[PDB]
Structures are given as C-alpha cells and as structure tokens.
Amino acid sequence: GLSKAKEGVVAAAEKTKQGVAEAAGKTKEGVLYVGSKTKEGVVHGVATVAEKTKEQVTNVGGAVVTGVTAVAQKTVEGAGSIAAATGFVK
Amino acid sequence: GLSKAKEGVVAAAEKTKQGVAEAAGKTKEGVLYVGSKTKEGVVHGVATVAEKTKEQVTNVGGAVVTGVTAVAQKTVEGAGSIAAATGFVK
Amino acid sequence: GLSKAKEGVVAAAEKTKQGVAEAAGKTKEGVLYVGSKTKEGVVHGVATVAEKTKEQVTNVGGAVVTGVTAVAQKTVEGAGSIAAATGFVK
Amino acid sequence: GLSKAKEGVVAAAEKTKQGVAEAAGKTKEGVLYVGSKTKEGVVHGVATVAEKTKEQVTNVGGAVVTGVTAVAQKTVEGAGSIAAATGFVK
Amino acid sequence: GLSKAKEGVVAAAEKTKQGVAEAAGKTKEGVLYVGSKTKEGVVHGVATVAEKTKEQVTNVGGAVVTGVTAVAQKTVEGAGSIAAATGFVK
Amino acid sequence: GLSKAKEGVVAAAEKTKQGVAEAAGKTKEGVLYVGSKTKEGVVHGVATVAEKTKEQVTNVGGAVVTGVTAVAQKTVEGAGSIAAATGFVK
Ligand SMILES: *[C@@H]1O[C@H](CO)[C@@H](O)[C@H](O)[C@H]1NC(C)=O
Ligand SMILES: *[C@@H]1O[C@H](CO)[C@@H](O)[C@H](O)[C@H]1NC(C)=O
Ligand SMILES: *[C@@H]1O[C@H](CO)[C@@H](O)[C@H](O)[C@H]1NC(C)=O
Ligand SMILES: *[C@@H]1O[C@H](CO)[C@@H](O)[C@H](O)[C@H]1NC(C)=O
Ligand SMILES: *[C@@H]1O[C@H](CO)[C@@H](O)[C@H](O)[C@H]1NC(C)=O
Ligand SMILES: *[C@@H]1O[C@H](CO)[C@@H](O)[C@H](O)[C@H]1NC(C)=O
C-alpha cells in the first residue's frame, strides 16, 4: 500500500482538484532492495523550475471576473443553496 | 501503509484541493534496505525553484474580482445557505 | 502507518486545502535499514527556493476584491447561514 | 574632432586590437542642438547583453594550447627576439 | 577635441588592446545645447549586462596552457630578448 | 580637450591594455549648456551589472598555466632580458 498523491484505500469518497503550477520532478518511490550489494552504487537527481516567469494581469472597468474556484459538496438528505465567486450588478 | 500527500486509509471522505505553486522535487519515499552492503553507497539530490518570478496585478474601477476560492460542505439532513467571495453592487 | 501531510487513518472526514507557496524538496521518508553495512555510506540533499520573487498589487477605485478564501462546514441536522469574503455596496 | 574608440588625430601610429565580447548598444555621439525648442522632447535607450552564456572548456593530456594573444612591436634600428604564448616540449 | 576611449591627439604612438568583456551601453557624448528651450525635456537610459554567465574551465595533465597575454615593445637602437606566458618542459 | 579613458594630448607614447570586466554604462560627457532654459528638464540613468556570474576553475597535475599577463617595455639604447609568467620544468 503506497499512494503518492491523493488516495490509497477508501470505501467511498469524492474529491475535486485544481492546479496552476510548475514542477520539475516528482514521484521517486519504491526504491527498496532485498538482497546484497558488493562494491558501488550511485543515485542522482536534479530539478529546476520557474525560470523567469513574467506575467501581467490588467482589468479596467469590468463587471464580473473569476480566476480560479473549486467547489465540491455532498448531501445525504437535505437542501443546499450555496454559491462561490458570484457577482451581482444592478 | 504509506500515503505521501492526502489520504492513506479512510472509510468515507470528501475533500477539495487547490494549488498555485512551484516545486522542484518531491516524493522520495520507500528507501528501505533488507540485506547487506559491503563497500560504498551514495545518494544525492538538488532542487531549485522560483527563479525571478516577476508579476504585476492591476485592477482599476472594477465591480467584482475573485482570485482563488475553495468551498466544500457536507450535510446529512439540514438546510445550508452559505457563500464565499461574493460581491453585491447596486 | 506513515502519512506525511494530511491523514493516515480516519473513519470519516472532510477537508479543504489551498496553497500559494514555493517549495524545493519534500518527502524523504521510510529511510530504514534492516541488515548490516560494512564500509561507507553517504546521504546528501540541498534545497533552494524563492529566488527574487518580485510582485506588485495595485487596486484603485474598486468595489469588491477577493484574493484567497477557504470555507468548509459540516452539519448533521441544522440550519446554517454563513459567509466569508463578502462585500455589499449600495 | 571626435573619435569614439581608438584614434582621432595622429601623425604616425600602429596598433593591434582584439575582442571576445558581447555588446548591445554603443556610439550615441554628436547630440548637439543649435537653435530653439518650444514644447517637448524625449530621448530613450535600453540595452541588454549576455543572457545565459553557458560554456565549458576541457583539455586533457595536451601539449600546447593557446587561447588569445596579441603582440605588436616597433623598432627603429635594432635587433629583437621576443616571444609570447610559446611552449617547448621535449 | 573629444576622444572617448584611447587617443585624441598624438604625434607618434603605438598600442595593443584586448577585451574579454560584456557591455550594455557606452558612448553618450557631445550632448551640448546652444540656444533656448521653453517647456520640457527628458533624457533616459537603462543598461543591464551579464545575466547568469555560467562557465567552467578544466585542465588535467597538461603541458602548456595560455589564456590571455598582450605584449608590446618599442626599441630605438638596442637588443631585446623578452618573453611572456612561456613554458619549458623537459 | 577632453579624454575620457587613456590619453588626450601626448607627443610620444606607447601603452598596453587588457580587460576581463563587465560594465553597464560609461561615457556621459560634454553635457554643457550655453543659453537659457525656462520651465523643466530631467536627466536619468540606471545601470546594473554582473547578475549571478557563476564560474569554476580547476587544474589538476598541470605543468604550466597562464591566465592573464601584460608586458610593455621601451628601450632607447640598451640590452633587456626580461620575462613574466614563465615556468621551467625539468
Ligand atoms: C436555494 O438557493 C436559492 C438561491 O440561489 C434560493 O432561492 C432557494 O430558496 C434556496 N433553497 C431552495 C429549496 O430553493
Ligand atoms: C438559503 O440561502 C438563501 C440566500 O442565498 C436564502 O434566501 C434562503 O432562505 C436560505 N435557506 C433556504 C431554505 O432557502
Ligand atoms: C440563512 O442566511 C440567509 C442570508 O444569507 C438568511 O436570509 C436566512 O434567514 C438564514 N436562514 C435561513 C433558513 O434562510
Ligand atoms: C633572436 O631570437 C632567437 C631565438 O628565437 C635567437 O636565436 C637569436 O640569437 C636572437 N637574435 C638574433 C639576431 O637572432
Ligand atoms: C635574445 O634572447 C635569446 C633567448 O630567447 C638569447 O639566446 C639571445 O642571446 C638574446 N640576445 C640576442 C642578441 O640574441
Ligand atoms: C638576455 O636574456 C637571456 C635569457 O633569456 C640571456 O641568455 C642573455 O644573456 C640576456 N642578454 C643578452 C644580450 O642575451
């Protein structure tokens, strides 16, 4: 049983996931040895991310703007009236 | 049983996740030895992130602006009226 | 049983997570030896993050602005009227 | 009389020049005004050089190696036995 | 009479020059005004050099290595036996 | 008579020059006004050099190594036996 990121063993579940990201190297798992070694061994890793990320955001005279939003709800027996990143203009 | 990030063993669950991030190297797990070693061994890792992240945010005369928001609710038997990152203009 | 970040063993749960971050190297777990070693061993790690993060935020004459918000509620049998990062303009 | 780099007025001369370089903008001379100006004037300049110059030099078991050398000599009436960047192997 | 770099007025001369360099902007000369100005004037300059110059030099088991050398001699009536960056191996 | 760097007025001369350098902006000369000005004037300059210059020098088991050397001699009537950056191995 090895789960790197989210779930390994569940009977019932539900999820929501988002990503605005930058990654070089993940997931170096299960490095296990059963036996014998005699002379030499070498392991090596190098990572480099996000070299000069240049970005500009401009918004003039807008009404509604939404960048990132994640909503997840579970109801067994009920009423739900929920909202997120909502904008009312009149 | 090894879960790196979120969940290893659950009977019932629900989650929401977001990321605005930068990462070089994660998840170096399960490095276990069962046996014998004689002469030499070397392990090595290097990480570098977020080299000169240049960014500007500008908003002039706006009405509603929403950058990042995460909402997750669970109800068994009830009424729920919730909100987040909401804006009312009149 | 080893859970690095959030949960290892739960019967029922629910969570919400957010990140605006920068990381070089995480998750070096399970480094356990069962056996014998004779001559030499070396382990090495280097991390570097957040090299000259330059950023500007400007907001002039706005009405509603929301950067980051996380809300998570659980109700068994009840009424809930909650809000966060809300703005009313009239 | 305006000489930017090497010589403006000479009766007798001799020179030697070398360059291993990188340059964006030179030689903005002779900006002189004779007259009148009334309302507005703008002058602007931007320069950027040497973006991530990556280079490696390797030499194994060599005998003679010469990278850069400049020699210039002037004699009126005489004997000259000069040398530079010379290598004798026996 | 304006000489930026080397020589403006000479009767007899001799020189040697070398460069391993990086430059953004030089030579903004002769900015002189003869007259009248009324309302506005702006002058502007920006320079940036040597962005992440990465370099390695390696030499193993060599005999003679010469990187940079400049020699210049002038003799009226005489004998000259000079040397520079020389290597004798026997 | 204005000489920025080396020589403005000489009857007889000789020189040698070298550079391993990095420069953003030089040579802002001759800014002289003859006349009248009424309302406004602005002069501006910005310079930035040597951003993360990373370099390594390695030499193992060498015989002769010469990086930088400059020699210049003048003799009217004589004998000269001079040397620089020389290496004798036997
Ligand atoms: C649910 O939310 C809405 C508004 O979005 C509201 O009008 C309603 O009364 C709430 N409940 C039900 C059962 O509609
Ligand atoms: C839920 O929230 C809404 C407003 O968004 C409100 O009008 C309502 O009365 C609340 N409850 C129900 C059952 O609608
Ligand atoms: C829930 O909140 C809303 C306002 O958002 C309010 O009008 C309402 O009375 C509250 N309760 C119910 C059952 O609606
Ligand atoms: C000049 O230099 C050489 C060696 O390069 C030497 O043999 C000689 O004697 C010197 N002078 C003359 C006149 O040759
Ligand atoms: C000049 O230098 C050389 C060695 O390079 C030497 O043998 C010689 O005697 C010197 N003078 C003359 C006239 O050769
Ligand atoms: C000049 O230097 C050389 C050695 O480089 C030497 O042998 C010589 O005697 C000196 N003078 C003359 C005239 O050669």
Residue numbers in the entry:
A (entry chain D), B (entry chain E), C (entry chain F), D (entry chain C), E (entry chain A), F (entry chain B): 7 to 96
From the paper:
We focused on O-GlcNAc modification at S87, termed α-syn(gS87), because this modification site displays the least inhibition of α-syn fibril formation, thus providing an opportunity to obtain homogeneously O-GlcNAc-modified fibrils for detailed analysis. We subjected α-syn(gS87) to aggregation and used TEM and cryo-EM to visualize fibrils, revealing various fibril morphologies, including double, triple and quadruple filaments comprised of two, three and four protofilaments, respectively. Due to the limited number of segments present in the triple and quadruple filament morphologies, we only performed three-dimensional (3D) reconstruction with the double filaments. The 3D classification resulted in one main class with two protofilaments seemingly related by a twofold axis. The resulting density map, with a resolution of 4.97 Å, corresponded to a crossover of 1,221 Å, an optimized twist angle of −0.7° (assumed to be left handed), and a helical rise of 4.92 Å. Modeling structures at this limited resolution cannot necessarily define molecular features, but the density map could fit a reasonable α-syn(gS87) model comprising the residues from glycine 7 to lysine 96 and an extra density corresponding to the sugar on serine 87. This analysis shows several salt bridges potentially holding together the two protofilaments (sb1) and contributing to the folding of the α-syn(gS87) fiber structure (sb2, sb3 and sb4). The electron density confirms that α-syn(gS87) fibrils are quite different from both the pathogenic unmodified fibrils we prepared here and the amyloids isolated from patient brains to date, and our structural model potentially explains how O-GlcNAc statically forces a different fold. In the full-length fibrils, O-GlcNAc is stable against removal by OGA. This is consistent with its position in the core of the fibril structure, which would be unlikely to be dynamic enough to bind in the required extended conformation to the OGA active site.
